[PDB]
Amino acid sequence: DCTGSEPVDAFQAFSEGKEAYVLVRSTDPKARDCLKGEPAGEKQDNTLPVMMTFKNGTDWASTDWTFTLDGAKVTATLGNLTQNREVVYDSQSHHCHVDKVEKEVPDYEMWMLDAGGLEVEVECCRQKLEELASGRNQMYPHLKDC
Ligand SMILES: CCCCCC/C=C\CCCCCCCC(=O)O
């Protein structure tokens, strides 16, 4: 309140591969509609296969990514694409987390359990996202007729 999980560990922030997370806030104007990530297999050493589901226009679509975990950092790969993230905030019970997408102009994202989370924890994630966004525009992918 609002001291979440310290230090942040990406695998624990993903409930150790036991849950799916939904994208609820993003500073990226290209954030995919209804974006959701769910584990597609067990963690092999430091590698976790993840299926991302979202709406591509009116139809549902899916992409199979490979996540490499390193402390709070996550390197996601698909074909020739590579996305580097750092989980900068993770709530007390891993009900939600805030990521920093590492690039020329870094983006900030809020992810929460598709199964639902405690209001107090969800509020802490929202607060942390608002602080890091600092006057930038925000997208709401979960409201896109999901
Ligand atoms: C197991 C919980 C994972 C939830 C956290 C998801 C983190 C990063 C997801 C980035 C995936 C990139 C989506 C881009 C859309 C695409 O082209 O497939």
Residue numbers in the entry: 23 to 168
The paper states:
cis-palmitoleic acid (C16H30O2) was the dominant (∼64%) fatty acid in the binding pocket of bOmCI, with various other C16–C18 linear fatty acids present in lower proportions. All ligands fit into the L-shaped pocket, with the kink at position C12 of LTB4, ricinoleic acid, and palmitoleic acid. Palmitoleic acid lacks the -OH group at this position, and in that complex the same OmCI residues coordinate a water molecule instead. The ligands are also of different lengths (C16, C18, and C20, respectively, for palmitoleic acid, ricinoleic acid, and LTB4); LTB4 fills the pocket completely, whereas the yOmCI-ricinoleic acid and bOmCI-palmitoleic acid complexes show a water molecule filling the bottom of the pocket. The three ligands all bind with their carboxylic acid head at the solvent-exposed brim of the OmCI pocket, hydrogen bonding to the side chains of Arg-54, Thr-85, and Trp-87. The hydrophobic side chains of Phe-36, Tyr-43, Leu-57, Gly-59, Pro-61, Leu-70, Val-72, Met-74, Phe-76, Trp-87, Phe-89, Arg-107, and Trp-133 contact the hydrophobic body of all three ligands. The main ligand-dependent structural difference with respect to the yOmCI-ricinoleic acid crystal structure is the position of the loop βB-βC (residues 61–70), which pushes in/out to accommodate a smaller/larger ligand. This movement is mediated by Pro-61, the residue at the bottom of the ligand pocket. The other main locus of structural variability in the bOmCI and yOmCI structures is the conformation of the βH-α3 loop (amino acids 132–142), shown previously to be required for C5 inhibition, which in both complexes of bOmCI swings inward, with the concomitant flip of the side chain of His-117. However, the chemical nature of the ligand in the pocket bears no relationship to the conformation of the βH-α3 loop, as the loop was observed in both conformations in different copies of the yOmCI-ricinoleic acid complex.
OmCI is a bifunctional protein derived from blood-feeding ticks that specifically prevents complement (C)-mediated C5 activation and also sequesters leukotriene B4 (LTB4) within an internal binding pocket. The 17-kDa lipocalin Ornithodoros moubata complement inhibitor OmCI, originally isolated from an ectoparasitic tick (Acari), is a bifunctional protein that may have such therapeutic advantages. By binding directly to C5 in the vicinity of the C5-C345C domain OmCI prevents cleavage of C5 by the C5 complement convertases, thereby preventing release of anaphylatoxin C5a and formation of the terminal 5b-9 C complex (TCC). We describe two crystal structures of bacterially expressed OmCI: one binding a C16 fatty acid and the other binding LTB4 (C20).
